Design an enzyme around this catalytic site. Structure first.
Site, mmCIF file in Angstrom:
data_model
loop_
_atom_site.group_PDB
_atom_site.id
_atom_site.type_symbol
_atom_site.label_atom_id
_atom_site.label_comp_id
_atom_site.label_asym_id
_atom_site.label_seq_id
_atom_site.Cartn_x
_atom_site.Cartn_y
_atom_site.Cartn_z
ATOM 1 N N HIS A 1 8.801 -13.604 15.366
ATOM 2 C CA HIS A 1 8.076 -14.710 15.984
ATOM 3 C C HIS A 1 6.970 -14.164 16.879
ATOM 4 C CE1 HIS A 1 8.520 -19.025 17.609
ATOM 5 N NE2 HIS A 1 7.296 -18.604 17.901
ATOM 6 N N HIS B 1 2.978 -14.189 17.995
ATOM 7 C CA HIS B 1 1.649 -14.757 17.997
ATOM 8 C C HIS B 1 0.650 -13.600 18.188
ATOM 9 C CE1 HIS B 1 2.867 -19.074 18.535
ATOM 10 N NE2 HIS B 1 3.995 -18.446 18.823
ATOM 11 N N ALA C 1 -0.858 -21.495 20.181
ATOM 12 C CA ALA C 1 0.290 -22.412 20.043
ATOM 13 C C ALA C 1 1.224 -22.027 18.906
ATOM 14 C CB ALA C 1 -0.202 -23.812 19.814
ATOM 15 N N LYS D 1 4.532 -20.686 8.372
ATOM 16 C CA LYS D 1 5.034 -21.321 9.567
ATOM 17 C C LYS D 1 4.714 -22.805 9.513
ATOM 18 C CE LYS D 1 6.308 -21.954 14.000
ATOM 19 N NZ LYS D 1 5.646 -21.122 15.015
ATOM 20 N N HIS E 1 4.752 -25.911 12.024
ATOM 21 C CA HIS E 1 4.730 -26.122 13.441
ATOM 22 C C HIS E 1 4.318 -27.550 13.731
ATOM 23 C CE1 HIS E 1 3.882 -25.585 17.717
ATOM 24 N NE2 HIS E 1 4.261 -24.311 17.616
ATOM 25 N N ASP F 1 2.623 -28.697 16.025
ATOM 26 C CA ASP F 1 1.258 -28.900 16.463
ATOM 27 C C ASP F 1 0.287 -29.093 15.299
ATOM 28 O OD1 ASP F 1 2.344 -28.373 19.019
ATOM 29 O OD2 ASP F 1 0.928 -26.775 19.447
ATOM 30 N N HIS G 1 9.151 -24.770 13.471
ATOM 31 C CA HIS G 1 9.178 -25.349 14.795
ATOM 32 C C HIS G 1 9.043 -26.846 14.548
ATOM 33 C CE1 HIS G 1 7.119 -25.638 19.098
ATOM 34 N NE2 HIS G 1 7.316 -26.869 18.612
ATOM 35 N N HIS H 1 13.305 -20.500 17.617
ATOM 36 C CA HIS H 1 13.754 -20.971 18.945
ATOM 37 C C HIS H 1 14.727 -22.150 18.800
ATOM 38 C CE1 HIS H 1 10.288 -23.597 18.274
ATOM 39 N NE2 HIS H 1 9.417 -22.589 18.498
ATOM 40 N N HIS I 1 1.111 -27.647 28.928
ATOM 41 C CA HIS I 1 0.767 -28.844 28.163
ATOM 42 C C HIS I 1 -0.111 -29.801 28.967
ATOM 43 C CE1 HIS I 1 3.734 -28.611 24.677
ATOM 44 N NE2 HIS I 1 3.670 -27.430 25.260
ATOM 45 N N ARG J 1 13.227 -31.778 26.946
ATOM 46 C CA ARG J 1 13.010 -30.523 26.230
ATOM 47 C C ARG J 1 13.640 -29.289 26.901
ATOM 48 N NH1 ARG J 1 7.465 -28.017 23.365
ATOM 49 N NH2 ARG J 1 8.065 -25.850 23.789
ATOM 50 N N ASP K 1 8.473 -14.717 20.553
ATOM 51 C CA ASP K 1 7.485 -15.772 20.789
ATOM 52 C C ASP K 1 6.342 -15.215 21.632
ATOM 53 O OD1 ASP K 1 6.328 -18.353 20.378
ATOM 54 O OD2 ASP K 1 8.207 -19.385 21.034
ATOM 55 N N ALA L 1 3.076 -16.825 23.554
ATOM 56 C CA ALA L 1 3.001 -18.274 23.393
ATOM 57 C C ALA L 1 4.068 -18.939 24.253
ATOM 58 C CB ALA L 1 3.128 -18.692 21.950
HETATM 59 NI NI NI Z 1 7.430 -22.790 18.500
HETATM 60 NI NI NI Z 2 5.741 -19.586 18.848
HETATM 61 O O LIG Z 3 6.879 -21.131 19.506
#
Ligand code: NI
Ligand code: NI
Ligand SMILES: [O-]
Ligand code: NI
Ligand code: NI
Ligand SMILES: [O-]
Lengths: 122, 570, 100, 570, 100, 100
Positions: free
Chosen positions: D137, D139, D170, D220, D222, D224, D249, D275, D323, D339, D363, D366
């Protein structure tokens, strides 16, 4: 003349979003036990199955809220939202696979919604 | 539903009529127009618009009108306008300026700016976006100079040198075929666009021309190699055949002629006059009169920019010590006094403001600062607003006219002068995606992200070990565009047409994008955007008084500048 | 902080100057790099204080004297140069023969 | 003649029955077996055994059973066992684990582990040797992140990004053919193994698949980009055709569905759930129920690992600020509270201990720390021993069972999930020689030497100007494996079968070793070494209480951790 | 010492903070990078002292006030973030609007 | 100054030592890198003072004691090595078991 580096001096007025498009108000219920938040640009008929509303009134529409914002529904919460019309070619593909084409195909969208258990189809 | 303007600007960046302060200056830019459709603004993140079936199209393959990269909600500051738009990049080039998203569901989408599966997103809301700076007076002395340039938003270096050799320490010259070949190879490792100047000196054509055929992008005439009538003439004959630019640092000493002799040698041909004010070099005391002629493309170098209370003391001493001049030798003092002149430095500020000097540049590591071309451009504009007022052509209380005049001096005008404006120098469709994002509070001081060929090359970013990228220390760092083989695709080596036709890239094993220098010989002052004024400049030989249209050009030095001690740790 | 390359580098000068000043405080005659560091840092801190280039050209000649440094160090240092951000932007200071 | 055990262990490292503390934790590993012949131990130096005619064979050419490199007297910690052996490397691969030396004069020499003229020696006596960590994971945001990873024993980065673009900040996504090609080129300069994930979003197959054909190693999904039923479905259809892994995700917002809707879209197909606890993202509040399903390969990211007194305050604030959420907007507070949940974070500790979450990951940049995957794995194991006791399966007072369960989470299991365990992820014969040496006092904190493809790439080493390498300052530094063209042979770019068949490496000029991704679609939870438990995980929608087998899973946060303030300067 | 990349980098923050504190001690209003450095170093030293994330979020708002910094600096700094090793491992601190 | 690579690197040790000494002054038991930095910097400053290698081998064992450092740190440090320029050129100092 205190200087805030990079500050804005915005002009007067207000920005009207989605100007000139029809608006529709509907009641929506989160019948589930977990929260649901819905973004400004999701085709409204294709949201979470457990949201109960008149699914027909979501076809061809999305939330009339600022771009990039979302409406939140806590578990059990019912509230009114305002929808605006989709623009461009008024076609939707993917998401929940209810449309995959023109939003004008209301009967086909609703038939799919009903078979898959999206709440609020007659 | 309506959004108040303050809130709107906080969420999506400013829109039409809104103004933004440039750093801690008094300069305000106003959004002239906006390409968006209100309510269908593009944005990226959790529950945001650029998601599949929504503002991201899930149907189209990359070839079908889909972007490789969308910069959302940019405030563009460019010679072409100050305006709000999305910027679309594909194959390393700017392909669309307009409105990005998904035509399925959004109104007003520019047809080749689809956000699709293939599309990366950079959020530019609340940023100012400019073209990368084009520095045309670079001495290649110390490779550490590249990051310095990138950190202040420069993306193209034109000049010469072989490192800290005396020839290179004095002159923007990479001399001869072999030194040129060596520096073209070196360039493969430099994360910036480059063009190399050969030595514009000789009395036969062949020794000069062979530099062009070897891969030079232009020539430099410099007094330290003999800025004689012959060297001037042969260099311009070469340039006219080869379609490259010639830069000149004229004969300060007036040894073989005065300014009028240099102009007669030039004989109406196009030439780029470096450090035209003359502190950086040139016919004492009147070189700056070059800037009035229609065949001259005039630039300033940066240490005289703008005129401050420490400028003269700093320059007189710098000149003496760097030329090994003695304070007790009257000829040395007379020379220094003839070259460093408050009268011409003060007038240079005003000539910039009036559009009579068209370009800025650095003179990096020779008599100028690699990382201060953009910085000092805006300090100059700010000083001129304070001393001269809003220009007559302004309205709405904005400084848009001045901002377009000044941004031109380090973006589009150098690019035009050098014959490279087909590739770089402005935010226009069809040009290479060299883009600089600025937080307004840091505008012209420290770039946020520098995009080279559509990939971030340099960024102000924090701790690499952190959970997120913003924790301290936030500093300028090279990004993935600089790493491995990607350095080849994100940067351009600019070369003469003849060297390209003769296969120099293949011969040397160059893997960088190759840019062609062209259309340098049938331009003039009239082609300099927002800075196209020709006029009779008179410099009084006794008093050094500068007159334009019968009026003395004078201004005072300032004790303080913006974009200075608020920002810098040293 | 948004440090640029020069800001990062010039932290080193301050650090070397601090080191040198410690050494001077415990009674050592200073060497060539120590002396250069002290005078250089002095220049850059003076700019930060808002002194003029002319003031720093004068003062930089009186920061260290012969008896602060090792034999030969005065004659090794012909001049010390530094650039720093004055209230009116970056300027160059050259201090000529700083240690007589 | 006999040697007492203390002396033996000091000279040759520990042998059967001996225990070693991992750093400053309470965890003890015991040597299970030893491949040596007592008295014929290999060692190198003045008057030592590996000398010509003695423990070094002087007869055989390299091809004839001779090693390129012998690691002497290693204490291996691996999913396959905790044991003492010599490790033999040849052509960049592990070719023998056993006993190295000279069959001329020594008993028990493994037949392809001859020390000959061609053989380099690394002394591993008193070191713990593990496989390089496999982070799935990542970024790609800041290239400085690579050294951070190497310094904590990570040798493979799988993920995505183009640098500090918002999409990459992200999501672990390199979107589309062009961004993929650019990052494959960039990878040529990164001294670590890499595989790149494309965007797992679209409603037509072709926009997704073309990323795989361009050189992506996986996808991936995600939220977003829209973690919708359609994007999930198309990505998994692609993956099933292409034989690559899909990471998810999920839709935190439950916008298009709840967890059961995501599982129905998945439809029994293999997927890697990132995650899985959900602070890092996913269906609120119950995403962690994914970890009970047989088709889910579940990983944690590292900032929740393990549950400490600062965890919740840190995460709630991090989520809000990243965020742009406001403390005075009730929807924003409700979202954050849904969350970031002490109930699921506490349960995540115990799910790791029980073998229900199979993998760790970072991660990086990120919402996780590039250099703390290994660190936090062992802090978790240590906390679980203190709170839960020795696992029932332990004996001899050792923590061997727990140590094999936990080392699996960042070595072999990610490799299996990604389809790369034929090349990397464990110390086994036939796999690439990615090896990490640890001083036990620094185990899991700071690697001593990181071997990549049989050459040291990274080391904690001192003053380069010194007479010897140990004087201060001792710091992490890139070694010769990273320099020049050797970076190509010491590292692997992992790519899809289709991109390899289509000649993408030759097209782009990639010189790195090319690894094939395969066998990702017909695995499941049962294939996760030591972490293969499937079960019904219930997460109470009102209280966020986690139950497994009718029992609430709860534990307390700790105020202090090992592998923390004793070691770090900041 | 076995310094890793972050430890090496973060020495720079301490150094910049020391520099800034010297400048404040001789009476200068601090600039943007000076202010950020002081507050950042404060956070990392607090973690080393064993304070909680919550304590540092509070304290970091009272390290410098308006009258310690140049005009505009308070409004330039929306928040300062640092990661440091607490007794319970690395954690992130964000100090929001540190200078009112 | 004409700094060479080692001079540049070794500034870091001084800096870490200063940081560590600050932490010790406010009452913290020192950790492993802090302790190493203090003792290392002590060695290099001793060389600069003109002490012998033999003097520094002795003194380096009495710079920090058990009660200055965290549990386990004494046993983590088997020896500390530094090279510095003595009056008779660069020499290596090794301090064995510096903290008893
Ligand atoms: Ni994620
Ligand atoms: Ni991530
Ligand atoms: O993530
Ligand atoms: Ni010149
Ligand atoms: Ni020059
Ligand atoms: O020049």
């Amino acid at each position: 003349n205190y200087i805030v580096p990079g500050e804005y001096r915005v002009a007067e007025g207000e920005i009207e979003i989605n100007a000139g498009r029809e608006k529709t108000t509907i009641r929506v219920s989160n019948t589930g036990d977990r929260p649901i938040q819905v973004g400004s640009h999701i085709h409204f008929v294709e949201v979470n199955k457990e949201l109960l509303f008149d699914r027909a009134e979501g076809i061809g529409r999305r939330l009339n809220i600022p771009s990039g914002t979302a409406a939140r529904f806590e578990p059990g919460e019912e509230m009114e939202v305002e929808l605006t019309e989709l623009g461009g070619n008024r076609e939707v593909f993917g998401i929940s696979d209810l449309t995959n084409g023109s939003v004008d195909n209301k009967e086909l969208i609703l038939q799919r919604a009903k078979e898959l258990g999206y709440k609020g189809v007659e | 539903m309506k959004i108040n303007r303050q809130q709107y600007a906080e969420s999506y960046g400013p829109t039409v009529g809104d103004q933004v302060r440039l750093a801690d200056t008094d300069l305000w830019i106003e959004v002239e127009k906006d390409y968006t459709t209100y309510g269908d603004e593009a944005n990226f993140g959790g529950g945001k618009v650029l998601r599949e079936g929504m503002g991201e199209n899930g149907t189209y393959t990359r070839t079908e009108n889909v972007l490789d990269l969308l910069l959302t909600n940019a405030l563009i500051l460019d010679y072409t306008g100050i305006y709000k738009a999305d910027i679309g990049v594909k194959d390393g080039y700017i392909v669309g300026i307009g409105k990005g998203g998904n035509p399925d569901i959004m109104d007003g989408v520019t047809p080749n700016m689809i956000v699709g599966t293939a599309t990366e997103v950079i959020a530019a809301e609340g940023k100012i976006v400019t073209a990368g700076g084009i520095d045309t007076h670079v001495h290649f002395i110390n490779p550490d100079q590249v990051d310095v340039a990138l950190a202040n938003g420069i993306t193209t270096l034109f000049g010469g040198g072989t490192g800290p050799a005396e020839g290179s320490k004095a002159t923007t010259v990479t001399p001869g075929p072999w030194n040129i070949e060596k520096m073209l190879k070196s360039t493969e490792g430099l994360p910036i666009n480059v063009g190399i100047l050969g030595k514009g000196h000789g009395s036969s054509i062949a020794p000069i021309m062979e530099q062009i055929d070897a891969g030079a992008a232009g020539l430099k005439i410099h007094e330290d190699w003999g800025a004689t009538p012959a060297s001037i003439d042969r260099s311009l004959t070469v340039a006219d055949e080869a379609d490259v630019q010639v830069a000149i640092h004229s004969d300060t000493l007036n040894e073989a002629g005065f300014l009028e002799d240099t102009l007669r040698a030039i004989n109406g041909r196009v030439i780029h006059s470096f450090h035209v004010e003359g502190a950086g070099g040139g016919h004492a005391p009147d070189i700056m009169a070059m800037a009035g002629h229609p065949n001259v493309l005039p630039s300033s170098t940066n240490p005289t920019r703008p005129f401050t209370v420490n400028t003269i003391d700093e320059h007189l001493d710098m000149l003496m010590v760097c030329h090994h001049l003695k304070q007790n030798i009257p000829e040395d003092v007379a020379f220094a006094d003839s070259r460093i002149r408050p009268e011409t430095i003060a007038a240079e500020d005003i000539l910039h403001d009036l559009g009579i000097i068209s370009m800025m540049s650095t003179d990096a590591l020779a008599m100028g600062r690699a990382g201060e071309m953009v910085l000092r451009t805006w300090q100059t504009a700010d000083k001129m607003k304070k001393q001269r007022g809003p220009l007559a052509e302004e309205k709405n209380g904005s400084d848009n006219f001045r901002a377009k005049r000044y941004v031109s001096k380090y973006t589009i005008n150098p690019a035009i002068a050098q014959g490279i404006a087909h590739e770089v120098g402005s935010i226009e469709e069809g040009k290479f995606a060299d883009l600089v994002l600025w937080e307004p509070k840091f505008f012209g001081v420290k770039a946020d992200r520098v995009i080279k060929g559509g990939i971030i090359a340099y960024a102000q970013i924090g701790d690499p070990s952190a959970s997120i990228p913003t924790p301290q220390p936030v500093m300028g760092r090279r990004m993935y565009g600089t790493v491995g083989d990607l350095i080849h695709d994100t940067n351009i080596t600019f070369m003469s047409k003849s060297s390209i036709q003769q296969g120099v890239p293949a011969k040397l094993g160059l893997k960088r994008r190759i840019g062609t220098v062209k259309n340098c010989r049938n331009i003039g002052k009239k082609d300099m955007k927002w800075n196209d004024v020709t006029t009779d400049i008179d410099i009084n030989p006794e008093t050094y008084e500068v007159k334009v249209d019968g009026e003395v050009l004078t201004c005072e030095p300032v004790k303080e500048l913006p974009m200075a001690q608020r920002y810098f740790l040293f | 902080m948004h440090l640029n390359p020069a800001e990062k580098e010039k932290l080193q000068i301050f650090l070397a100057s601090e080191l040198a000043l410690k050494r001077k405080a415990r009674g050592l005659k200073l060497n060539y790099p120590e002396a250069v560091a002290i005078i250089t840092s002095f220049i850059m801190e003076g700019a930060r204080d808002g002194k003029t280039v002319a003031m720093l050209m004068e003062e930089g000649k009186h920061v260290l004297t012969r008896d602060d440094v090792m034999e030969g160090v005065p004659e090794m240092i012909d001049d010390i140069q530094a650039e720093a951000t004055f209230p009116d932007g970056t300027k160059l200071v050259t201090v000529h023969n700083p240690i007589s």
